[PDB]
Amino acid sequence: QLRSWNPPSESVDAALLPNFTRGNARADDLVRNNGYAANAIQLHQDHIVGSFFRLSHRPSWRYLGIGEEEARAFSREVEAAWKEFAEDDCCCIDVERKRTFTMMIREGVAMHAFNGELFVQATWDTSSSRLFRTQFRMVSPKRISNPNNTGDSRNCRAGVQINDSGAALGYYVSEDGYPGWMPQKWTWIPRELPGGRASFIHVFEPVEDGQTRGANVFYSVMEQMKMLDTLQNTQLQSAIVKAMYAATIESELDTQSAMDFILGANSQEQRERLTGWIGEIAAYYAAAPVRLGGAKVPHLMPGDSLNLQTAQDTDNGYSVFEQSLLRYIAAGLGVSYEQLSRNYAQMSYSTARASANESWAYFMGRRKFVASRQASQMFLCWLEEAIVRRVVTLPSKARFSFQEARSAWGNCDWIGSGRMAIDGLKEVQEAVMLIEAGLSTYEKECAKRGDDYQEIFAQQVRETMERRAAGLKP
Amino acid sequence: QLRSWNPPSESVDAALLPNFTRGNARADDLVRNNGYAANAIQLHQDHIVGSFFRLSHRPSWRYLGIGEEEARAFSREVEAAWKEFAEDDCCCIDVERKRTFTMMIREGVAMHAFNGELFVQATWDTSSSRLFRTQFRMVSPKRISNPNNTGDSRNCRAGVQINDSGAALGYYVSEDGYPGWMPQKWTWIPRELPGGRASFIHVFEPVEDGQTRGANVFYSVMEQMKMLDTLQNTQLQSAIVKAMYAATIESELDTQSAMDFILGANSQEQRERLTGWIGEIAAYYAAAPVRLGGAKVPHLMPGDSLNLQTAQDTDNGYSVFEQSLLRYIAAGLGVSYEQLSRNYAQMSYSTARASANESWAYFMGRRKFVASRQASQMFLCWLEEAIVRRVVTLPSKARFSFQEARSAWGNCDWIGSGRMAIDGLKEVQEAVMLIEAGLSTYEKECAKRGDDYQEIFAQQVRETMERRAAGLKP
Amino acid sequence: QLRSWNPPSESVDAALLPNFTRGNARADDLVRNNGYAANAIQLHQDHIVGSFFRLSHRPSWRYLGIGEEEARAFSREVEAAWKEFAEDDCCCIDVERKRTFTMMIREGVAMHAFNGELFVQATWDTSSSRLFRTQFRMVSPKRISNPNNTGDSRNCRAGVQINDSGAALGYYVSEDGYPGWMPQKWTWIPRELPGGRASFIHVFEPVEDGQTRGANVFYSVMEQMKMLDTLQNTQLQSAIVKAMYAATIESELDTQSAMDFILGANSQEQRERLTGWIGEIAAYYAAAPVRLGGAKVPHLMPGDSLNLQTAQDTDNGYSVFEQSLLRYIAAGLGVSYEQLSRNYAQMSYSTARASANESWAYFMGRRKFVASRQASQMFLCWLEEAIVRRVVTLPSKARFSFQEARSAWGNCDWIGSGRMAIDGLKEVQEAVMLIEAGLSTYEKECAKRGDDYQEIFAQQVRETMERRAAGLKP
Amino acid sequence: AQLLAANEQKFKFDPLFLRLFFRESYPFTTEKVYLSQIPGLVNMALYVSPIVSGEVIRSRGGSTSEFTPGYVKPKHEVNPQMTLRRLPDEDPQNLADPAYRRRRIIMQNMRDEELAIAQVEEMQAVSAVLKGKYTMTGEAFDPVEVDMGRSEENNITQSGGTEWSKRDKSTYDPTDDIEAYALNASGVVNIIVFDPKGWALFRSFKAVKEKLDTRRGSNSELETAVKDLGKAVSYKGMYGDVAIVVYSGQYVENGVKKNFLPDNTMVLGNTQARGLRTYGCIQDADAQREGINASARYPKNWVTTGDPAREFTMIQSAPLMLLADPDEFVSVQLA
Structure with missing residues (x-):
């Protein structure tokens, strides 16, 4: 079985890139034919981004000498601008003109999960319906190959032109293949502009040094493919052969030496004996009507029957095989099957909350690992455009210029899915302890709750004043 | 089976280095083909570093005569500088220009887990986008071999040039092999500069004296390889032979002496008997249509059938074999399988919290053992650069110079993953007891909580004043 | 099976030393091939030393007439000096220049666990980066053999030169064997200097009088070796023979006397009968295509088949054999397997906390038995060096000189792993009872908590004053 | 009774035969020597057409593959009663x-062994390359003649015709005979090692x-080999x-000593002739169950309990060393 799937013995990058197309193609096959990939990407979406992905700008006020109040007001301005620019209802923020920021993050994270890499391009849109002429078009991974599909070279390696030190200079984007009859032409695309401008945002997780591509799926999913095939076929055979039945006719006849002599005489010159016996047996079956049930017994003149003696008859064991292996690959691939297909077998209280909190912290890990890159890159490009357009005003006491301290000025964090609910009592006792001991700040409280302290305080002011005015109890 | 894997009887270093390439290559094979290594490295990442790795500078104020307040303010300055330098959004802190500090620690810890060693190099970047011209390029372990792949020698031993006493002077870095056709050339690299400057940070855990390389994985994982193979093949055979069926035809015929005499006469000169019988049987099967199901019974003229009598039919036992062995190697390799593939079988409350606290303390062990080295080395290099650039001001009353007391001045600790959550009630009763009895300090409280006392107090001030102003309840 | 492993009947020292090399070599084999030794040494590390090993100097103030306050201030000075000297970030405290104090204790305890002995040497480093010119190089146990590998003698016994009374005078250190081609030369090393200076710290646990070496591992682990081998092989055989199947062909033929006469006639002169029958059967199998499945039935002309009748078919019992024996050797070797490979089977609350507290107290035993020796020896050497350098000031009213009362002056204790957590409620109710009844002192409270009373009080002062200043609640 | 590992010599000083002509060791898991099993010389010429490739090539079935290894x-005793x-x-x-005393006496005993x-x-080697015949013989054992197949022109004699003794001691040059015997040797001869009086009349x-x-x-x-074994091989010169x-x-036999070499003999051949060291089964239960x-x-060192309640050192082997090409050396008896 190791024949149809073969690992070379070498560093992972040189063991994957030669068989990149086959592994990725069979990955496409399984993610299309199989529901597990859809469920996994959907849960990753709903744990990492969830409803939305919220920007929070925190310029390094302490290091830059900027006042915290000026930083906070400038952040208010940039947050209002960014939310109003992102909430465009006409899907107009993409060059394809059919994806908002939500689906920017969606397709980016999905493709960085599947192929391990995502490709964003900051292009200059001309549609004047918005103040900001920068859109972000996502680039397929099929596009990145060496110019004219040539094999890897000295410095042109699977489509990326690098130096001897590996520094990613640029890329050869092959032309799109949709419809299925466009030819591919390779075009030069630099990774970033010299001034720090993020033109081609290439975010991938390298497992080792010098690696150019991300992680796969199929190269650990062939075994589900062939287990589902084998369980499927074995259930089919079991079902079809629980009551397969042979309906033949035998007789006494069979006078050993006499039967053999009759057969030999028929073979030599006395076939009339066989013809007469066949006629008698045909008359037998047409005067009997030899019929078993609703159907006719298949015509068998005496002396021939099937021997449907069977193989071993122990239990198939597939039960504990499949539970063990589903277990196995479930906290292999990472998301547990007791919800990837939802068993409720013997699961208990500590079971539930321990599994939930470890899995949720681990999704927080993946979120902070493979979402903040895209978030910061897009925010940096948008903030550069805003500074170009003088939408928001930089602090006058800027210790470093915007172009010099884009990292310092464009320092930001992002908020993923909403408020976690698992037990209730858990979150509420945590909340009461934090609010009584002061062990929670504005920033981490809002991180835990998916809200904002400024708005909760303003709305509590509104709550109290409306209760006082209408006669309610604050 | 001991044939394809062979231990010599000798000290571990001389028992591993001769078979270094084969063991490491099969380790690559299993970490690429198998999901367990990916899950283990991911959990090690999320337990050791987690979200981030936080620096805290504590110069030995008491021993150096430095005031604690001056030390704390100087630490504030260096922490602001280090966070703003580390938060670079363009991935520009590496010579490869594609990894931030997070992935510095990530690749370093991953490679120090796999090969037991990690190789960092402090190089002088020329990119002027940042104030600090020092980057840190990580060096592959394949690079360290004797000059031109020569075998171990007197003092040149597997790439490291040492003295008779073993002191690691320098290294022979072979040229990179990506693309797969660059030749290797060996270049001299000293371990550290004489002035204490950390040029080539070589952090590895030696199991014994004189050992040069770290620990492996495959040399304890071949048994998972061959157990997964054997369970896979045995399930395939069981599935395919639960209903294998022989469909042959026998007849009465068989007149012992007469049949033998007929066969002998046919062999000698009377093959016409066999031809006539074969013709009669062909007419038999073409006038019967001998058909069992949806398929035709394979053509068997009388007197020959398969004897599919089987072997023993006891239960395979693989169930308790595999549970015992998964158990076995699970708290062998160290991370328990009841989460490396997530069983929820009969697991209880004391089960959960005892296992969780012991495993988490043990990850705290690994963190403090294999992360603080890299953290302190990188911090020392960065602080030396900062002193060169006069970014932060050393205390005027320095009892020892910076170059003399780099260890004393650059004394630091680091914070790994965020706030542990397992039970809730546990952590909260611990917190209330510590805050009532005063049994927790600033430093260990912040270690337990993943926060900072200065910022929690400042934000509590902000909390109270905003509640007072807006009308809320402090 | 007792053949490949043989105990003589004699005192343990003379029963082990003759077979020292073989037992130690197979111990190396199993600790290298097997994960149990790695897990056991790792847990011993994390229970004995854990994060760090903390010095606490308590000169016998009452007996020496020294004031307790002067002793405490002098201890403060020596503790600051020792921590700053131990925290060297360049790994420079060893002659190998690659191990700090942590890995001093690590390798020492690991080798004193494996071979039962550890060998430290106080050498005079010349590297002037630190004030203290004393380093401590650890010496391999392979080095200690009689001069030129001679067998034991009257007073030169396995490398140690002793008197008739057994007093260990010195040692014959064979030259290092790394690379694997250095010759060994034996050099004289005294155990200690006459003035009480600890030159060659030889710490081993002697089971009886006159014993020179420590305890082994393999001489109780051969049975795991051969049980793992037998379970491995029996699972392989069970898997391969659950569905082994013989595919032969028999026929009716077999006319007893006629077949025997035909065979005899063929043997004598009538082989043409056999040739004709073989031709007929070959035509049979080439006109039938006798094929069972996806594969061809192996060619068997009639009259020969395999008799795969089996042996007994009772359950193997290996299940309860292995549970009983794992049980057995688990609280043999000492650390229970319900965590050396982590079973959660039917384990309960009293189970958990009783097992945990007894095992932890027993690790406290091992810690105080095999760590305090090395700690006190290293502290004595370092304190002697400090007195030589006048780093810390001895009390003026010294009732005895430093050289005379090194034991009295250098009296010290050490703190191992951090604060134990098992249940929470347990530790907190203990803490509240101790703090209400006063049944806990500074020293044993800090021993239980892994902290310091002076620093907890100073930091509580800081806590209260910062809460008062910022507006929080003390 | 001491362990197996107490078998350290680092003393391999065989007289240039088993180390220089007969390096080709073949220890077997089977009793006899099966020359058909040994590949020996491989069928080593034919290629295949530039379209496809040909059949499978085997070990080319040695005609005779059945001789009894020696x-x-x-054994000996190492009884601690001697000085x-x-x-x-x-x-x-x-x-x-x-x-x-017991350990270095087992050292001495086994090295003698x-x-x-x-x-x-x-002695087997000198029989082999002096006549092509070897006498696998011993009491309570049938004498098997193991023949490599030395040809008649490899056994031609100097005394036939004119003898070197019956020649001019001053003007006659035996070089003519040297190439005369070297031509039918299937190769070049580069050592002319004589027995003493043979070299004397040469x-x-x-x-x-x-x-x-x-x-x-x-x-x-060869100079290095002579410096090593300065005992009985004497490099006369060029x-x-x-x-x-x-x-x-x-060799020092049961009661007397005598030279390995006969009175006046010669073998003409190369220093790189192929010599097989086929080795049979080792009949020791220890050897079988440890492979x-x-x-x-x-x-092995081992104690007998009972009638011969003592302790012994036992050495076991089974060599059947031969020469691959008996025609490689011309064996001449001299004048």
Whole structure:
């Protein structure tokens, strides 16, 4: 079985890139034919981004000498601008003109999960319906190959032109293949502009040094493919052969030496004996009507029957095989099957909350690992455009210029899915302890709750004043 | 089976280095083909570093005569500088220009887990986008071999040039092999500069004296390889032979002496008997249509059938074999399988919290053992650069110079993953007891909580004043 | 099976030393091939030393007439000096220049666990980066053999030169064997200097009088070796023979006397009968295509088949054999397997906390038995060096000189792993009872908590004053 | 009774036969030698057309593949009742130890043992390359003649026709006979090792003595081999083109001693002739259950309980060393 799937013995990058197309193609096959990939990407979406992905700008006020109040007001301005620019209802923020920021993050994270890499391009849109002429078009991974599909070279390696030190200079984007009859032409695309401008945002997780591509799926999913095939076929055979039945006719006849002599005489010159016996047996079956049930017994003149003696008859064991292996690959691939297909077998209280909190912290890990890159890159490009357009005003006491301290000025964090609910009592006792001991700040409280302290305080002011005015109890 | 894997009887270093390439290559094979290594490295990442790795500078104020307040303010300055330098959004802190500090620690810890060693190099970047011209390029372990792949020698031993006493002077870095056709050339690299400057940070855990390389994985994982193979093949055979069926035809015929005499006469000169019988049987099967199901019974003229009598039919036992062995190697390799593939079988409350606290303390062990080295080395290099650039001001009353007391001045600790959550009630009763009895300090409280006392107090001030102003309840 | 492993009947020292090399070599084999030794040494590390090993100097103030306050201030000075000297970030405290104090204790305890002995040497480093010119190089146990590998003698016994009374005078250190081609030369090393200076710290646990070496591992682990081998092989055989199947062909033929006469006639002169029958059967199998499945039935002309009748078919019992024996050797070797490979089977609350507290107290035993020796020896050497350098000031009213009362002056204790957590409620109710009844002192409270009373009080002062200043609640 | 690992010699000093002509060791897991099993020389010429490739090539089925290896298993006692070989003044107090006396006496015993098997193996070698016949024989054992197949022109004699003794001691040059016997040797001859008096009447001719070069003119590692085994191989010098050696090795038999070499004999051949060291099964339960059924030698130290309640050192081997090409050497008896 190791024949149809073969690992070379070498560093992972040189063991994957030669068989990149086959592994990725069979990955496409399984993610299309199989529901597990859809469920996994959907849960990753709903744990990492969830409803939305919220920007929070925190310029390094302490290091830059900027006042915290000026930083906070400038952040208010940039947050209002960014939310109003992102909430465009006409899907107009993409060059394809059919994806908002939500689906920017969606397709980016999905493709960085599947192929391990995502490709964003900051292009200059001309549609004047918005103040900001920068859109972000996502680039397929099929596009990145060496110019004219040539094999890897000295410095042109699977489509990326690098130096001897590996520094990613640029890329050869092959032309799109949709419809299925466009030819591919390779075009030069630099990774970033010299001034720090993020033109081609290439975010991938390298497992080792010098690696150019991300992680796969199929190269650990062939075994589900062939287990589902084998369980499927074995259930089919079991079902079809629980009551397969042979309906033949035998007789006494069979006078050993006499039967053999009759057969030999028929073979030599006395076939009339066989013809007469066949006629008698045909008359037998047409005067009997030899019929078993609703159907006719298949015509068998005496002396021939099937021997449907069977193989071993122990239990198939597939039960504990499949539970063990589903277990196995479930906290292999990472998301547990007791919800990837939802068993409720013997699961208990500590079971539930321990599994939930470890899995949720681990999704927080993946979120902070493979979402903040895209978030910061897009925010940096948008903030550069805003500074170009003088939408928001930089602090006058800027210790470093915007172009010099884009990292310092464009320092930001992002908020993923909403408020976690698992037990209730858990979150509420945590909340009461934090609010009584002061062990929670504005920033981490809002991180835990998916809200904002400024708005909760303003709305509590509104709550109290409306209760006082209408006669309610604050 | 001991044939394809062979231990010599000798000290571990001389028992591993001769078979270094084969063991490491099969380790690559299993970490690429198998999901367990990916899950283990991911959990090690999320337990050791987690979200981030936080620096805290504590110069030995008491021993150096430095005031604690001056030390704390100087630490504030260096922490602001280090966070703003580390938060670079363009991935520009590496010579490869594609990894931030997070992935510095990530690749370093991953490679120090796999090969037991990690190789960092402090190089002088020329990119002027940042104030600090020092980057840190990580060096592959394949690079360290004797000059031109020569075998171990007197003092040149597997790439490291040492003295008779073993002191690691320098290294022979072979040229990179990506693309797969660059030749290797060996270049001299000293371990550290004489002035204490950390040029080539070589952090590895030696199991014994004189050992040069770290620990492996495959040399304890071949048994998972061959157990997964054997369970896979045995399930395939069981599935395919639960209903294998022989469909042959026998007849009465068989007149012992007469049949033998007929066969002998046919062999000698009377093959016409066999031809006539074969013709009669062909007419038999073409006038019967001998058909069992949806398929035709394979053509068997009388007197020959398969004897599919089987072997023993006891239960395979693989169930308790595999549970015992998964158990076995699970708290062998160290991370328990009841989460490396997530069983929820009969697991209880004391089960959960005892296992969780012991495993988490043990990850705290690994963190403090294999992360603080890299953290302190990188911090020392960065602080030396900062002193060169006069970014932060050393205390005027320095009892020892910076170059003399780099260890004393650059004394630091680091914070790994965020706030542990397992039970809730546990952590909260611990917190209330510590805050009532005063049994927790600033430093260990912040270690337990993943926060900072200065910022929690400042934000509590902000909390109270905003509640007072807006009308809320402090 | 007792053949490949043989105990003589004699005192343990003379029963082990003759077979020292073989037992130690197979111990190396199993600790290298097997994960149990790695897990056991790792847990011993994390229970004995854990994060760090903390010095606490308590000169016998009452007996020496020294004031307790002067002793405490002098201890403060020596503790600051020792921590700053131990925290060297360049790994420079060893002659190998690659191990700090942590890995001093690590390798020492690991080798004193494996071979039962550890060998430290106080050498005079010349590297002037630190004030203290004393380093401590650890010496391999392979080095200690009689001069030129001679067998034991009257007073030169396995490398140690002793008197008739057994007093260990010195040692014959064979030259290092790394690379694997250095010759060994034996050099004289005294155990200690006459003035009480600890030159060659030889710490081993002697089971009886006159014993020179420590305890082994393999001489109780051969049975795991051969049980793992037998379970491995029996699972392989069970898997391969659950569905082994013989595919032969028999026929009716077999006319007893006629077949025997035909065979005899063929043997004598009538082989043409056999040739004709073989031709007929070959035509049979080439006109039938006798094929069972996806594969061809192996060619068997009639009259020969395999008799795969089996042996007994009772359950193997290996299940309860292995549970009983794992049980057995688990609280043999000492650390229970319900965590050396982590079973959660039917384990309960009293189970958990009783097992945990007894095992932890027993690790406290091992810690105080095999760590305090090395700690006190290293502290004595370092304190002697400090007195030589006048780093810390001895009390003026010294009732005895430093050289005379090194034991009295250098009296010290050490703190191992951090604060134990098992249940929470347990530790907190203990803490509240101790703090209400006063049944806990500074020293044993800090021993239980892994902290310091002076620093907890100073930091509580800081806590209260910062809460008062910022507006929080003390 | 001491362990197997107490078998350290680092003393391999066989007289240039089993180390230089007969390097080709083949220890088997099977009793006999199966020359069909040994690949030996491989069928080594034919290629295939530039379209497809041909059939499968095997070990080319040696015609005779059944001879009995000389399974030799002697033993001795190492009873601590002797005063031993005392190397000059290395602390006889350890000899006073029964432990050190017993271990270095098993050292001495076993070294005698392998040099015994080495000397009997050298007698086998001298029989082999002097007549092509070897006598696998012993009491309570049938004598099997193991023949490599030495040809008649490899057994042509100097006494036939004109003898070197019956020639001019001054003007006659035996070089003519040298190439006469070397031509039918299936190769080049580069050592002319004689037995002593054979070389004596060889050099009795003047032409020999002013044709030979006494100088070193170090040709190969044969000088190093002579420096190693300065006992019985004597590098006379250069005869110009060819090296002149004399072997005067001696075996000390049951009651007397005598030279390995016959009175006046010669073998003309190469220094790189192919020599097989096929080795049979080792009949020792220890050897089988630890897998030393296919090896060179097997030592053991072991105690007998009962009637011969003692302790012995036992050495077991089974060599059947032969020459791949018996025609490689021309064997001549001299005048």
